[model samples]
Target: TWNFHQYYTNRNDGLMGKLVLTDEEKNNLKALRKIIRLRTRDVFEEAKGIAKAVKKSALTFEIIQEKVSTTQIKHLSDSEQREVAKLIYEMDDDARDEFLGLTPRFWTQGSFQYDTLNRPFQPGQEMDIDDGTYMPMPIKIGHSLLILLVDASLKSLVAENHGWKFEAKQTCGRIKIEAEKTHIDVPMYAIPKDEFELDSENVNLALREGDRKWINSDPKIVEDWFNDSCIRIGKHLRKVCRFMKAWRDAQWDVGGPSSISLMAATVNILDSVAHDASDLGETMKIIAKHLPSEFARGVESPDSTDEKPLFPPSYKHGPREMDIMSKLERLPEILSSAESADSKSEALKKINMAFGNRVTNSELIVLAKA
Candidate 1:
């Protein structure tokens, strides 16, 4: 009943971004980071001047005197508050809201912000490492910016002034440090309410132009949640997530599922199935097998009292549930083929198709030599 050629593809190379980088490559990346930072600072200061000029306009001054009786700026003196209020009042209602969202300053957040620059696998640990270095997933180099007042008019004006292109619905723009290589895109966002103060009653929302509404987005919160859970879960979840992401990349399946969704699902499954410590292959197989049965159970009891879905809630819809089902449905047959194989190469071939281009012929030679 099995068609061997159906699953396997002509692409026999290992994961695309999972290669070990040379020391020279690492040094180049570090130097590029510095270069990007300097340029970013220069552009930001220029934008500030535009904002200041708008604040000093007569229209802004009138609005400030009429509406802004109190100041939100913490350390400003009375006169300073009036000036800042006038500056804020100069913008239209939408612009004013966007400006308020970006106050009081700009900062970077995300993997790069924490200085967790993803590195290649360590020497002699390509497939047998643990902790952060466990997986050989290639690092994606980029920047993420969190800043103030990212409204439509300002976005357009800033791009026109600087000759940069900013994409809408994302509040993100890209700048090229090199002609084709080392291009960096950063998403600018307003600070969420809870991030500023613990007692603040504001819902966590990032400013975006897509739907004219505050989106439920806060990179810091998501990063912190993952970091804390990584510690609690003994850090295996990190490697697990990395492996899954690498696999996802190789599949090239569009509109399947998001990296976050896959990470959340795998982590949740590990909490329920994995024991004190499980090897990489064992954990992956367990997760793959568990998925189909879980969905089947959910299907059987579609009208259960608990209305909540089994997987995490996705704000943007896709074929996530169906994608998992399709993958899991094919998993057992792949695993069975590997189980029945006589040689390591045969087994590897079966496993490779199941997990994407995770292993190659050269790597199989390495396994043989080892």
Candidate 2:
């Protein structure tokens, strides 16, 4: 018999950063990025200064001859040094604006630090027409279906089981994903299959362009296809490096997040990340050089500086659009011998618990369901 009257007073107030309004929330959020859009002008003033010194340096003759070595600017190329100068210069109006306008890079950490409430359903959910056409499930849901592609295999599984599916590898180079906890569900259809192939990978290959579209896009259809042959034989493999089960009553449970394995999952995912690829091999080389020291520790690392990322240009030029397809391409070997199905899942859960809050136990269950 909980009373709504005392609810606010009863709970530990510190946990509710975005849920409850206060001066601190106002200040932190106001100074921070917006909850919905999440674009932050959080200028790293100190980092920017370091970048300025690195890029804007004018080597004196004595310094160049006596002190400077090619090893000093080893990270930057002759042309890349020019680009870094432009990227860091405050006086170049266009470059400055572009640099400032860059959106905060979206990664796994601290993604769901705010709460989002759903707006009420309106005429968009369903509509009636003078021609006697009747539609259900609101207009927005239908409109969103065009690009959202809700009825895909993953979403269909989630609807039936309250869990999601992941494809670590795919022949088509796409990854299908959806979650139950939050307003996040989308398919990655045209992601580049390899970073090296980014310039060459087919960005258009999908079921819609072929006969077996259901396996990739049509939900119920793909669900039937998968159950009929894929999941039954364990042949429809996806590189699910990690997974966390959902809460007891995920769909009905609203107290926590329903996703899992964002950070900890990175460990198992690194296996795929480090795995051999035709095009993305360069990326692995760079990541390997930085791992176990900076980017990732207790993980694999390259032995030489030649493997490090000198600049984003060289970094960006690696495998483009690489996603789950690449992982599936290697699954038969990783799962070479039968092992614990829970090993991968447990490993990922442990990692998320330590570093990421989005994939809590309750939320993980929901994400599995979603």
Candidate 3:
């Protein structure tokens, strides 16, 4: 019944078809990426020169942001790189130092990586679902680069000098930069070990040890983990993930459980529940039944004996953990009540309300009119 509803409505658009990117959108994203690359180069040159001039090995800038993709071509053209090099070389020691002081100990973060099921809802429109909702929607072709600081000092300096505001109240305690309508978030992570390996034999976890916080995290590892898990569990799990993500997006707030946590939680739940479910509907129902217990249990960290909740490791000190858990405690009851509806319309209404207005009255009205 729920599967029929999903198909009848356009909610499964993300699973069915990929979001089409406009030429203009593609060009804009490429340009934005280029700007980020050039700025990264500027920071490296300035910082390296300063370290060399002062003979300080502590502030050396050897590792620039390496493009993660194997097929990714050089971001800067040879001419552009040479021009940038010439400009950096011409700067005096004092000038270089001054530039270095302005450089933030950070890397530009963005959602440039490809996802097989990713698609945006309302691609170019103002209500672009992916842009508005942090869930990896197939909508929203372009992405803005957010700063990911290496340490507290650099985070503070950037927050103080740049227009980035410290979100102390949030679970992540991340830095926020409001650029017009788009807010750029800065999440601080520790610098990885010098010999960071992306292979399975690597034991040393990349720690995000900044802002008096720590998480055994690495994006590469996380991505690989999810990919492998999806392959093992089934591709259908991704559909469930998209469904859960869409629901999460509707209820999402600044301190709400992150997209990553939601996906992880879904995976955790499905691991225990019916992996032998006939269809997406059965899986959805199973997930809905287990969500309360799953979140209530909280995730256990590999490093610590203590249980960490939906919020990231950096946000453990805040009361948002209990707040989120309390909020999610009622989710199972809501799903259960919706399932008990006698009539289809009433069931649809209840289901829509429970799953965050995915199937709205306007949509039903449009369907009726058709």
Sorting all predicted structures by TM-score, with the top scorer first, yields: 1, 3, 2
lDDT of 1 by residue, 186-295 (tens): 45433333344231122233433455443334455545656776787765566556656555544544333454556556666776775433344556657667756655
The TM-score leader among the candidates is 1
Query: Model 3, residue 166: what's the lDDT?
Result: 43
lDDT of 1: 0.43
For model 3, what is the error of residue 132's alpha carbon versus the real structure, in angstroms, after optimal superposition? 22
Off by over 4 Å in 1: 1-40, 50-166, 174-185, 192-204, 276-278, 293-321, 361-370
How well does each candidate superpose onto the true structure, as a TM-score?
Answer: 0.56, 0.17, 0.53
Q: After superposition, how far is residue 120 of candidate 2 from its true place, in Å?
A: 24
For model 2, give the 10-residue run with minimal summed lDDT. 126-135
Task: For model 1, name the residue pairs that clash.
Answer: 102-148
On the 0 to 100 scale, the lDDT of residue 270 in model 1 is 74
Candidates 1 and 3 compared: the better one by TM-score is: 1
> Top lDDT: which candidate number?
1
